[PDB]
What we know:
The structure is cut from a larger assembly and holds 2 copies of chain A. The radius of gyration of chain A is 17 Å and the shape is flat. Chain A has strands spanning 24-33, 43-50. Chain A is built from no helices and 2 strands. In chain A, strands 1-2 form a two-stranded antiparallel sheet. By secondary structure, chain A is mainly β. At the A-B interface, loops of A face loops of B. Chain B: It is a single-pass type I membrane protein. Chain B: This is Spike glycoprotein E1. Chain B: It is found in: Virion membrane; Host cell membrane. The PDB classes it as virus.
Amino acid sequence: VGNIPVSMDIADSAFTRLTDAPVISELTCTVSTCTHSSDFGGIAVLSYKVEKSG
Amino acid sequence: YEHTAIIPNQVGFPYKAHVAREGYSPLTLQMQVIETSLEPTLNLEYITCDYKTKV
């Protein structure tokens, strides 16, 4: 039943810094195959080069 | 899935059938035939033997 609502006061260690993160370049997401009702369903190919990995 | 096709009834001629399901590469089934003989259901009404007179 229902939908459990909740606020999550997240810690700054969870808020891992965006400037301190590796930056990826040129993301293109290509959905290869979609099932209309499955569990996994969508095979999507995010093609995006990595100026900074991680 | 469950494909259905009609291969030719001329044996030797290979029959491709590329079935494409979800997430699989196209499975091309190869059909080949040999010896599909007819065998009609019959019933004898003769023996076909020669006569022999007993005198």
